[PDB]
Amino acid sequence: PSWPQILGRLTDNRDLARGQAAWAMDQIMTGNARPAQIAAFAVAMTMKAPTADEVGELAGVMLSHAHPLPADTVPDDAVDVVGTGVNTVNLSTMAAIVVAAAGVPVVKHGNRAASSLSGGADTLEALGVRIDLGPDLVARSLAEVGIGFCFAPRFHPSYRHAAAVRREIGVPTVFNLLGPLTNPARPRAGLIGCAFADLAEVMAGVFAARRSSVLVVHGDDGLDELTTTTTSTIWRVAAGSVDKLTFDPAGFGFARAQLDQLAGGDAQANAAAVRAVLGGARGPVRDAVVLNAAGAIVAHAGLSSRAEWLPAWEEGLRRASAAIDTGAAEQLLARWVRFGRQ
Template identity: 40%
Template sequence: MEPKNLLEKILSHISLSEVEASYLMHQIMEGQLVPTVVAAFLVALRAKGESAGEIAAFAKVMREKATPVLAQGGQIIDTCGTGGDGSGSYNISTTAALLLAGGGYKVAKHGNRSMTSRSGSADLLEALGIRIDLGPEQVAACIDHCGFGFLFAPSLHSSMKNVGPIRKELQVRTVFNLLGPLTNPARANVQIIGLYDANRVLQMAEVLRLMGTQTAYVVAGLDGLDEVSIQADTRVARLKDGEIAEFDFDPENFGYPKASLEEIRGGGPDENAQITLGLLSGNIQGPKKDILALNAGFAISAADGVGLKEGFHKAEELIASQRGKVAIEMLRTYTHSL
């Protein structure tokens, strides 16, 4: 199998087979291709439009090459977005993940430092006093003991060192923007994935189905937010028992008034940490609390197999209980004891 033949195929707008896509990703991850050729493949795939089969094959190889995080069996949730929506919102999905951990769910939060925003999930957790420089066994122990483990992407995806500089130089979105949420090293089996592009939610749900995910929601705000939005409707694809359904979600139908992006805006890591603590202490109300309840509610709906209304109700109860704040304190103590 010659890389140049695969490139010609992509340039002819023909999708790669699973075997071809797997071979290509192995070549990229193992540093077998020079940077200019890798860049050519990434741009050609973007121009053609990556197929669900290609994305799934790439993700399987990337996950296979990741350092595994072996938490004890059972249900594990990940709330992860592609990022890059440019909204400047506070760290919604990470705050939701901490809230879920406080509610007794097990969460393997896959994330990184800020790429385009002022504060990534790693930056927020550090500002909260939670250690993120942990090995895979320690992260697994955090999931088992605290209900939350942070899977710091650069530490667990060492093969990405061959791609990072190329992505940085290209400065355009590539298939790797989609692969992050699909390659959780803890093999999360319940996922809430936020996308920057509402036109891709159905495709991403199909990718998750091909990868064997049990239950998932793929969401994209019609305003470009890679979360369940409070400003606009959200395009949603639900995966359950191998079946995919797509619908538009309006928060006002569930009693949540629309609000502007300005009202959910965050700042740097320290400011966002104060917002997270304020929310999980029950001290911040309004749109910031509402969008937290919406995103946590979707995760609860997926994890518990209940309707969205019940998911939102439980999320509101968890926020009021301040158990998310207890989860932060527990994580702070436990991670510093390792």
């Protein structure tokens, strides 16, 4: 294999041969790829339209270079809640806290962002959470708080050349999919949002080849989370298969919201919204947080429970609303801040 061979196949709009994506990713992860090569590959893979097999190789090779959490410190039923990217870091941050407050272990994965729009880590820091912890400490956090956060650069140091290139070019590429696919705690369940229906289906394919119970979701308004402004598409993944469906939260009594109402802002704006919602403020933002938290709980249930789709959603919505209303979510955040200060 070589760059001219792989790049040529992509620019010819052809799927790669098995092993080629992995070769490219390993070159990237080992410092052997020139920045021009990295960028050409990222762009060509994006414009060709990546397959699940290709993205599975990229993520898999990336994971092989990552630091893991210590042996047996991640509960078998840990979940992630995240979107691939305007962003909904506000929503996924709140949902994660609500989910952990409902009693489900959560482990997230993220970085500080250059943008005025908050990355995952930025909003959490604004809330007083300590985001850059080593594997042993992330593990303690999980055991004692029921939530943990893996700071991407610490857990994926060998991804530094790819990350640099991605910032240099700015444009979204297939590499934007790797974050939720490379959570170093390797949780087996989750709610994973994607802004593009076609890439969502590709990610669901990747999760299907893993031992996973996941809802990959796409708002039909383009949101990378379950939306309340219209329907969403859900790729339900369990036991190596995928069940794709149209989902409508009006069936659970959610009023229709407007897109402008749900969008995240900078870290400080987000932190303010988090305090209002966890303190009980009603509105479109709470509704979307509850909806996505419930979705993550439904995914979690798929790991063990044999509860069917509809009663799982009903219980998921009950648990998520209750985690907010009883102050459990506000208390968990405070406990999370305490853990860091100590």
